[PDB]
Amino acid sequence: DELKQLVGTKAVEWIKDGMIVGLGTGSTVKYMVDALGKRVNEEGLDIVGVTTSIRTAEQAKSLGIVIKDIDEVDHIDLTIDGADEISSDFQGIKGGGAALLYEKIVATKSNKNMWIVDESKMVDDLGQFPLPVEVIPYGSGTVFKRFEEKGLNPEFRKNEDGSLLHTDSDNYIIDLHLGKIENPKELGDYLINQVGVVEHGLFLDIVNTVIVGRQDGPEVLEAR
Amino acid sequence: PNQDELKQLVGTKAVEWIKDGMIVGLGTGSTVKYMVDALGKRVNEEGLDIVGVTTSIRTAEQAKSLGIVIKDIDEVDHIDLTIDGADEISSDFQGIKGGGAALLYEKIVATKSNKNMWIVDESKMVDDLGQFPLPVEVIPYGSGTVFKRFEEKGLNPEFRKNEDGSLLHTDSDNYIIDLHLGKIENPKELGDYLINQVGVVEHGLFLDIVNTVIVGRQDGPEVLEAR
Ligand SMILES: [K+]
Ligand SMILES: [K+]
């Protein structure tokens, strides 16, 4: 929590008056949103937020931040979100919290993307964290069998009570337990070209800046 | 009229490919309607034994009303043959589908199927695809943004509406944007672009899929072996 809070506080230095800002999810982002509300309510910062989730929208609105729908703004200047893993090549896995689709829709509209993470999220190669894939329910068992045959070690995502998780768009999630993803661009191409795959959790050539929480403070890394 | 008679002709001709014990994918549309009627006849009046796998809620409603057994696609381990319609078939046997808004489940079923047969009246045969607007199935969240990207890309998009003017919802509860492209000279490139767009679930280009086409002509059905 200590690392998350220094990073969330540092991140809001990137926000400028007049901006439209995408706000992501996670414990790390929660600290950032609190520090953003601080600036809005003490320093007169004027901005509009777009969020990847309800929980964040409700937090931002309780702080007096104006939130609009994605299709109500003509651009997003900067989106600040967390990540489940970030590799040495600055490719990400996201959607551990099941919102990979809306996260990618917000990221794609955004001019810049910043990810804020503690040190434990930085890996050499992606793949220890299971890769989520959003799948149309009808035929999802057959998609699962294709993934099993390819060697991707698929598992359907469950709610705490063991029922199938349904996403915001009413799809299922299949997590792939891959171990190591040496070629994420090849895997992403395979996945998106499978019938019934709506989106996957590889966020490739997206993040521009990363802020990493280390024991000695936040470190800023430029990706692209 | 003449067009209904051609659709009737190919729908009746198509059911000859159906044999006892097959698992058959059932398409969607006004031509498929005749085929499902013909299949029902063979089931109820000839004791033909098969299992159907549907591509839309409409087709399942028709098949159930006829006593055709329908199984979920994930309850069958293979599909022998799928018989569906098409909005356009090009001279190299590529298709546009989705005029009936069922492109996604149509493509899911076709992909499981060992063989795919399309049944059409002669008006469906084109040299190049594209006069018929290309349907694209899109996630609702962010779909105005997607629409604007297509507009900027010069793709002439239009959201699919019901007859009352409200937005059409597909069986999976997505929207459809039809693209008024006029002529599509490189459909593989176009398919690749569309599927790579965030928020696009599936598109109506059905490339290197169809095996057999039955075309209803003025002098009868012509069977074309595509691949
Ligand atoms: K896909
Ligand atoms: K897509």
**Residues in CB range of B201: below 8 A, 6 or more apart:** A136, A198, B104, B137, B138, B139, B172, B174
Q: Determine the distance from the C-alpha atom of residue A179 to the mean position of all C-alpha atoms in its chain, rounded to a whole number.
A: 20
Are residue B39 and residue B88 in the same domain, yes or no?
yes
Are residue A100 and residue A204 in the same domain, yes or no?
yes
* B152 near A CB under 8 A: no
* B112 near A CB under 8 A: yes
Contact A101 B139 (CB under 8 A): yes
d(CA B162, CA B154): 25
Are residue A108 and residue A145 in the same domain, yes or no?
no
Nearest C-alpha in B relative to A75: B145
DSSP lists the bridge partners of residue A154 as A176
* CA–CA–CA angle B211, B212, B217 (5° rounding): 150
Q: Resolution, rounded to a tenth of an Å?
A: 1.7
Contact A104 B198 (CB under 8 A): yes
Angle, in degrees to the nearest 10, between helices A27-40 and A54-62 = 30
Nearest C-alpha in A relative to B206: A195
Are residue B187 and residue B207 in the same domain, yes or no?
no
Q: Does residue A222 lie in a domain region?
A: no
Cβ–Cβ < 8 Å for A92, A223:
no
Are residue B36 and residue B13 in the same domain, yes or no?
yes
Are residue B112 and residue B35 in the same domain, yes or no?
yes
Q: Give residue B146's domain range.
A: 123-195
Domain count, chain A: 2
Cβ–Cβ < 8 Å for B48, B20:
yes
Task: Record the tokens describing residue A74, joined without a space.
Answer: 């003509």
Q: Determined by which method?
A: X-ray
CB atoms closer than 10 angstroms to residue A160 = 6
Q: Does residue B175 lie in a domain region?
A: yes
* B139 near A CB under 8 A: yes
Ligand 2: centre distance to CA A149 (Å):
23
CA dihedral B192, B193, B197, B203 (to 10 degrees): -60
DSSP per-residue string spanning chain B: -HHHHHHHHHHHHHGGG--TT-EEEE--SHHHHHHHHHHHHHHHHH----EEEESSHHHHHHHHHTT--B--GGGSS-EEEEEE--SEE-TTS-EE--TTS-HHHHHHHHHHEEEEEEEEEGGGB-SSS-SSPEEEEE-STTHHHHHHHHHHTT--EEE-B-TTSSBP--TTS-EEEEE--S--S-HHHHHHHHHTSTTEEEESEE-S---EEEEEETTEEEEEE--
DSSP lists the bridge partners of residue B51 as B23
A182 is catalytic: no
Residues in A closer than 8 angstroms to B105, CB to CB, are 138-139
* A170 near B CB under 8 A: yes
Q: Compare CB distances from A193 to B104, B145, B195 and report the shortest one's residue.
A: B195
Are residue A99 and residue A1 in the same domain, yes or no?
yes
- Phi/psi-derived region of residue B90, left when phi > 0, alpha when psi is between -120 and 50, beta in every other case: beta
For residue A12, the distance in angstroms to the closest alpha carbon of chain B comes to 25
Contact B74 A140 (CB under 8 A): yes
Q: Is the four-CA dihedral A173, A178, A183, A187 of positive or negative sign?
A: negative
Q: Does residue A223 lie in a domain region?
A: no
Task: Record the tokens describing residue A48, joined without a space.
Answer: 């509009």
Task: Record the tokens describing residue A216, joined without a space.
Answer: 């000695």
Q: Does residue A221 lie in a domain region?
A: no
What single letter denotes the amino acid at residue B35?
A: M
Q: Does residue A142 lie in a domain region?
A: yes
What single letter denotes the amino acid at residue B185?
A: E
Residues in A closer than 8 angstroms to B145, CB to CB, are 70-71, 105, 109
d(CA A15, CA B204): 41
Does B220 belong to an annotated binding site? no
CA distances from A168 to A3, A53, A127, A210, B36 (A): 30, 9, 25, 27, 35
Are residue B8 and residue B50 in the same domain, yes or no?
yes
* B3 near A CB under 8 A: no
Are residue A104 and residue A210 in the same domain, yes or no?
yes
Q: Does residue A224 lie in a domain region?
A: no
d(CA A121, CA A82): 9
Q: Determine the distance from the C-alpha atom of residue A133 to the mean position of all C-alpha atoms in its chain, rounded to a whole number.
A: 13
Residues in B closer than 8 angstroms to A195, CB to CB, are 107-108, 111, 202
Interface subset of A 39-68, CB within 8 angstroms of B = none
Ligand 1: centre distance to CA B5 (Å):
37
Q: Which one is catalytic: A103, A134, A155, A199?
A: A103
Ligand nearest to the CA of B202: 1
- Which of B59, B97, B111, B159 is the best substitution to test chain A (most A C-beta atoms within 10 A)? B111
Q: Where are the beta strands (DSSP E) in A136-186?
A: 154-156, 172-176
Are residue B103 and residue B205 in the same domain, yes or no?
yes
* A111 near B CB under 8 A: no
- Which of A71, A174, A189 is the best substitution to test chain B (most B C-beta atoms within 10 A)? A71
Are residue A38 and residue A90 in the same domain, yes or no?
yes
Are residue B41 and residue B127 in the same domain, yes or no?
no
CATH of the domain at A157: 3.30.70.260
10 Å CB burial of residue B41 (0-12, 13-18, 19+) is middle
d(CA B182, CA A50): 36
Q: Does residue B145 lie in a domain region?
A: yes
What is the widest separation between alpha-carbon atoms in chain A?
Answer: 57
Q: How many CB pairs under 8 A join A and B?
A: 64
Q: Does residue B45 lie in a domain region?
A: yes
- The binding site of A for substrate comprises 25-28, 81-84, 94-97, 121
CA distances from B121 to A85, B74, B217 (A): 53, 32, 7
Contact A196 B108 (CB under 8 A): yes
Q: Compare CB distances from A70 to B72, B111, B142 and report the shortest one's residue.
A: B142
Task: Record the tokens describing residue A14, joined without a space.
Answer: 């990137």
CB atoms closer than 10 angstroms to residue A158 = 11
Contact B74 A139 (CB under 8 A): yes
Nearest C-alpha in B relative to A108: B198
